[PDB]
Design a binder for this molecule. Sequence first.
Ligand SMILES: CC1=C(/C=C/C(C)=C/C=C/C(C)=C/C=C/C=C(C)/C=C/C=C(C)/C=C/C2=C(C)C(=O)CCC2(C)C)C(C)(C)CCC1
Ligand SMILES: CC1=C(/C=C/C(C)=C/C=C/C(C)=C/C=C/C=C(C)/C=C/C=C(C)/C=C/C2=C(C)C(=O)CCC2(C)C)C(C)(C)CCC1
Lengths: 311, 310
Amino acid sequence: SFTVDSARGIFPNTLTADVVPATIARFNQLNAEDQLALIWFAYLEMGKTITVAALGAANMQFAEITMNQIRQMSFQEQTQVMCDLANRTDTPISRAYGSWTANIKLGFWYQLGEWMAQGIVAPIPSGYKLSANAASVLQAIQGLESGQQITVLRNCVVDMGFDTRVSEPVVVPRDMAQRTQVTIEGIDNPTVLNYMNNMNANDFEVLIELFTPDGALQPPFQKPIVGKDAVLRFFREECQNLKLIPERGVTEPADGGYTQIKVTGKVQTPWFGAGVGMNMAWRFLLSPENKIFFVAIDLLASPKELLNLVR
Amino acid sequence: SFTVDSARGIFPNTLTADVVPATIARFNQLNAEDQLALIWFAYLEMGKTITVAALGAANMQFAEITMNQIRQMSFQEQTQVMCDLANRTDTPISRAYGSWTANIKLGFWYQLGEWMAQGIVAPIPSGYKLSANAASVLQAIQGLESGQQITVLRNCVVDMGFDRVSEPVVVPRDMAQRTQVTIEGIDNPTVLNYMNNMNANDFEVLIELFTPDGALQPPFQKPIVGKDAVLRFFREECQNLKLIPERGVTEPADGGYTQIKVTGKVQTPWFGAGVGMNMAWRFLLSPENKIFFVAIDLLASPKELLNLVR
Ligand SMILES: CC1=C(/C=C/C(C)=C/C=C/C(C)=C/C=C/C=C(C)/C=C/C=C(C)/C=C/C2=C(C)C(=O)CCC2(C)C)C(C)(C)CCC1
Ligand SMILES: CC1=C(/C=C/C(C)=C/C=C/C(C)=C/C=C/C=C(C)/C=C/C=C(C)/C=C/C2=C(C)C(=O)CCC2(C)C)C(C)(C)CCC1
């Protein structure tokens, strides 16, 4: 009936925010110093604050030695290390950065940014002029949805340093008594509801059992992650402490007794809490036995896409 | 005084056509069947005629095995191989495709395109509808200058398959038939002979213009560092181009270095005089007048051909 690759195209009227990869591609053309300065100004205009809970994350112990070495370097040495990271140059610090998780890399740059404000780490030079191309990229970022802006910033951060490792603890699932349950207008399918509720409870061991053995999950702007082993690994490293707020859905038959379901809603990341709500869609292809053969998670082009629930 | 990474920023207000990498990134989000259909329509609706001869016999002998093997497959199997390439799947055909130079990949698809119009290779299904995202990408492409359009298409094609072939020998043009460029405002022989040696396919002489550690940065790519890697890039990528530089400016840089910017047109053998690409060359020359760094940029618009600020 279906393959993972043939499942990718379900609900093809779904308009995803491909301006996000487009803008990252433009950013990737800039030289190291331009990139660092662009992100500094983009972060400022973003006008959103990282939560205290994320700011004190215990995983930063893996980077403490590296940050404290940078803090002691001269401004000229600090600037060179930051360019090495942006250039993806092969240096020892860049290799250590490359072994870190995404959340550690983000906390690393958050700390360096705090230090630049406090006069401890070399700042963006007072008379830096963004290149013509960089200024245009900066403007484009200012015109994005807040959810789209933080996705551009995160993906730029994650891709610096050396190409691929630190292992982090996994959050403990929320107690059954403390759990909430989602309500999706138009959807009572238990597999989809269980997906949302177990995600919100960080109950990844129950979540993975919703999938077929050859099932796949496709994160935004990434290729499908195939098989329970790889999906469970992805859940444990990337999907911690999210808040999924699905609100609307539609279900319809597919070939071979399969069912395809599209859900739209908002998602909050623990980095920003309720400060940023990203507009998402989930596209499910469910087997006749009510298991997830494929789910794609998309960042939507604009809030009106929340209402786009035709077949 | 300079490093390769620090040389990248010379002439920083050169406005490049970064809509090209932006659009490629959008194309990369589409599924395989949407990608193939989009290129088919873009390729058909373009008003520019391709010429082969840009190809070469020693080049296409590498893809002949694969093309004959495809021509014997059912329509079903053909679409599968065609999707495997778009998806960059690990298959032996996708691995063979991944080992080819850009021109071999292009000639391969050119032949498949002709066979599709002939009913030999499985066509795009009749009345196929592009996804919402794919329709927007197609509209963006058809809004681009033709030079930018063909750059999007090429890069889309080059990126397919699973990521070698011994690229055949390129003998330079006979000295007597050679042209000499004229660059308004530029008499530096290292810049002039860069131009003239490229136009003559004389890459073994061209590479001697570089410093031992010199770098060349192609459009929308990272620098290629060192003579060995630059030389290999010349043979695999740079055959039968026609460079038509028009003007340039020169200015001293730190440490006895010189930086030079030239703007003009480039024609590819695939399209001849039918498509002129708007290009800037940014040179950093050592105190000994060798090329330490050269960047080649695709420019955002013809307006940028006049942007020669020291
Ligand atoms: C660098 C740099 C600097 C620092 C910049 C900083 C500090 C940037 C920080 C950016 C941050 C903190 C971004 C946070 C982004 C988080 C995101 C975008 C999370 C998205 C999560 C999603 C979308 C979840 C999706 C999913 C769902 C819903 C599923 O159902 C399946 C699983 C899962 C897929 C994953 C300084 C400025 C100072 C200047 C120099 C350069
Ligand atoms: C797939 C596919 C199909 C076939 C599509 C085909 C058949 C597409 C062919 C497109 C072609 C033929 C594009 C050619 C583009 C060539 C370009 C863009 C060349 C640019 C070269 C430049 C700019 C040179 C720059 C340089 C200069 C000036 C230097 O000084 C230094 C070196 C060098 C840097 C390199 C079919 C539709 C049928 C349907 C299914 C999908």
